[PDB]
């Protein structure tokens, strides 16, 4: 693992992409290295630290949701339209059909936990939309503010049972949602 010397570490950091160029870290590794940074530019690194701290506190101020809240047709108008300025929702319309509702329900809890920044709401099709066809068993109709932003209706759109944990992140984010910490379009396979 870390049984590698200075030359080996330089070789690895050069081979990975190019270099970390002492400008692209979070509050963790720029804080832990803490000694490779040369001392003639303390003001620049401290200004960067203060701006990143401001960014972190701003992000934590708007991270207040944490988990999905499920609603009925009564308040559906308010959480589909009056959810807030600069916030978009998920609106997973689900039933007790086992496969796709079950998988998506288990995955959305994890996504909401790891994204406390975006609203997750799930509703049952019977009492949210009058006489929904119910053949298109999944339904995540993403609303940007109150308008259409994306739509996933068919199990073929997701791909059926073969759904992993985090490719849903990319599927939601491709429409313009919060950025991803993951690469590759269809999460490899």
């Amino acid at each position: 693992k870390e049984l590698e010397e200075e030359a080996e570490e330089e070789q690895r950091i050069l081979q990975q992409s190019v270099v970390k160029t002492y400008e692209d870290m979070t509050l963790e590794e720029l804080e832990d290295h803490e000694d490779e940074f040369n001392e003639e530019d303390e003001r620049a690194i401290e200004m960067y630290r203060r701006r990143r701290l401001a960014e972190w506190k701003a992000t934590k101020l708007k991270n207040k949701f944490g988990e999905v809240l499920e609603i009925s047709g009564k308040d559906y108008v308010q959480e589909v339209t009056k959810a807030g300025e600069g916030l978009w929702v998920i609106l997973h319309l689900y039933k007790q059909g086992i496969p796709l509702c079950a998988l998506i329900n288990q995955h959305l809890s994890g996504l909401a936990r790891k994204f406390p920044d975006v609203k997750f709401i799930k509703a049952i099709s019977t009492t949210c939309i009058p006489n929904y066809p119910d053949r298109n068993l999944p339904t995540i109709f993403v609303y940007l503010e109150g308008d259409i932003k994306a739509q996933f209706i068919g199990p073929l759109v997701f791909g059926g049972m073969n759904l992993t944990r985090d490719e849903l992140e990319w599927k939601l984010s491709e429409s313009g949602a919060i950025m991803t910490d993951l690469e590759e379009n269809p999460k490899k396979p």
Partner: protein
């Protein structure tokens, strides 16, 4: 349209490709033919990343060369193999392989199947190993004079030869300071515990191996003493500040006296950890992770010098030197884990950097080479030569045998197996003698490099090298003359020579068994 194989697949077959393979090896043997001998010539290599490598050894030349011909790729892999296994004889093995293929091509043309050539090559390899073991002489390990002579023989053909009388000593010291006895058996000699570090600028002979460890760190706090006479060093792996943990805690506060109580709990935890460290009375604490402000304050109140994050290899060599032991949980920091024996700890300033020395320690098992020179490339070449000398010293301490140098042993084994082949009969005798005169290139290479005429000199050498136990007679490449290597006094470990011969013959077999090439397709 209609295809069987891929569109991009190309195929080559027949003697054509065989010739190509041989030629490829010769080309690889042609780049670094002038780098062999005490009169070698430096070569400059331009890295794709902007660096420059100014070197002599063959491996450092080939590792910077990319070849799309797969036979040359095999030759480069052979060079890396010889560099890693023994650390010496790269140019010798590459030249030997090149000339063995070059002489096997002649038999390939004369409608001879490669299999008989391979069999003769293997027989020649076995016989040359036998007769190379025959002419060997023992070496006295306890004798330091002969050790210095062997390292001089290994270093006379590099750029630091002018400082050989220094450099050899350095290598010897390091190799005789890492020598360790493991649990019961398993004597070891590892270069992970022999670090060479380059500090540009200064004087080359100012370089020396320190009786201890040097790292490029600084004291955590200004008030902590930068000069410790007899340190008691404790080595830490974990961190000395407060960390969240692993599970999700999410402490809930409803009272007025829980927030400040939480913060005071963090402070008291740091205080308790530092008091656990302090109670056993250390003097220097080395940690691989960060140090909290409270941590260094509490350590300082007990007059302890704290060195912040240190790479794990440096901590391992520090532990091996001082005799200490790394502990992650401070509450289990035992008395036996405290490092006593470090003769002096000094935070010196070199150029515009702070360097910490734990030198003067008793009977260390790890060393650091203060290698001071003039430039980064000069120091890189110096440390490469030091690594070669270290590898040769380890080879001769693990093998008490020696063999004459300057192409004397090669000519001796060539003549021995030539006289062996003169009695047998068959079709395999011709490749046998082909290998016999194939081992002859390196003396010829030395004579060519020194600037003398190879024809008459090598003819005289071969003629005189036939009678009256003259197997130690070789060429002096400084004066380009024929000398008896006993008076000249250049000897090489038997391991290096036998490994060179084995690797050359095996590379010849590998590139001679091949007759078809299919190029261009998906990985799998």
């Amino acid at each position: 349209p209609v295809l069987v194989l891929s569109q991009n697949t190309k195929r080559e077959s027949g003697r054509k490709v065989q010739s190509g393979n041989i030629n490829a090896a010769k080309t690889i043997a042609d780049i670094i033919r002038t780098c062999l001998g005490p009169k070698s010539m430096m070569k400059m290599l331009l890295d794709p990343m902007g660096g420059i490598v100014m070197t002599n050894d063959g491996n450092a030349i080939l590792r910077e060369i990319q070849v799309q011909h797969p036979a040359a790729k095999s030759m480069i892999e052979i060079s890396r193999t010889q560099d890693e296994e023994v650390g010496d004889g790269t140019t010798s093995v590459i030249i030997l392989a090149g000339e063995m293929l070059s002489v096997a091509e002649h038999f390939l043309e004369q409608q001879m199947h490669p299999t008989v050539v391979i069999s003769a090559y293997r027989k020649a390899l076995d016989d040359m190993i036998s007769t190379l073991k025959k002419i060997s002489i023992p070496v006295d390990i306890s004798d330091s004079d002969m050790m210095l002579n062997i390292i001089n023989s290994s270093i006379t053909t590099k750029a630091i030869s002018r400082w050989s009388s220094l450099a050899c000593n350095i290598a010897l010291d390091a190799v005789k300071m890492v020598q360790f006895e493991e649990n019961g058996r398993k004597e070891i000699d590892i270069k992970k515990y022999a670090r060479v570090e380059k500090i540009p600028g200064g004087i080359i002979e100012d370089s020396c191996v320190l009786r201890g460890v040097m790292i490029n760190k600084d004291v955590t706090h200004p008030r902590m003493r930068r000069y410790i006479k007899n340190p008691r060093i404790v080595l830490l792996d974990s961190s000395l500040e407060y960390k969240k943990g692993e599970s999700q805690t999410d402490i809930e506060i409803t009272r007025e006296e829980d927030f400040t109580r939480i913060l005071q709990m963090e402070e008291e935890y740091i205080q308790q950890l530092c008091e656990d460290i302090i109670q056993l009375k250390p003097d220097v604490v080395i940690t691989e992770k960060g140090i909290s402000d409270l941590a260094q304050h509490y350590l300082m109140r007990a007059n302890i010098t704290a060195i912040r994050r240190v790479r794990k290899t440096d901590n391992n060599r520090i532990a091996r030197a001082c005799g200490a032991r790394i502990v992650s949980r401070p509450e289990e920091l035992r008395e036996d884990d405290v490092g006593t024996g470090a003769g002096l700890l000094e935070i010196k300033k070199i150029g515009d950097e702070y360097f910490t020395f734990i030198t003067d320690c008793k009977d260390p098992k790890a060393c650091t080479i203060l290698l001071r020179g003039a430039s980064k490339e000069i120091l890189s070449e110096v440390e490469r030569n030091l690594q070669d000398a270290m590898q040769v010293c380890r080879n001769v301490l693990l093998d008490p045998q020696l063999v004459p140098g300057g192409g004397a042993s090669e000519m001796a084994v060539a003549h021995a197996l030539t006289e062996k082949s003169k009695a047998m009969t068959g079709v395999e005798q011709w490749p046998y003698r082909a290998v016999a005169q194939a081992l002859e290139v390196i003396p010829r290479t030395l004579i060519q490099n020194c600037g003398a005429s190879t024809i008459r000199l090598l003819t005289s050498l071969r003629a005189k090298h036939t009678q009256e136990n003259c197997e130690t007679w070789g060429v002096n490449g400084e004066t380009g003359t024929l000398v008896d290597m006993k008076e000249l006094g250049i000897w090489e470990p038997l391991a290096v020579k036998l490994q060179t011969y084995k690797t050359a013959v095996e590379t010849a077999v590998l590139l001679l068994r091949i007759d078809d090439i299919v190029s261009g397709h998906k990985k799998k």
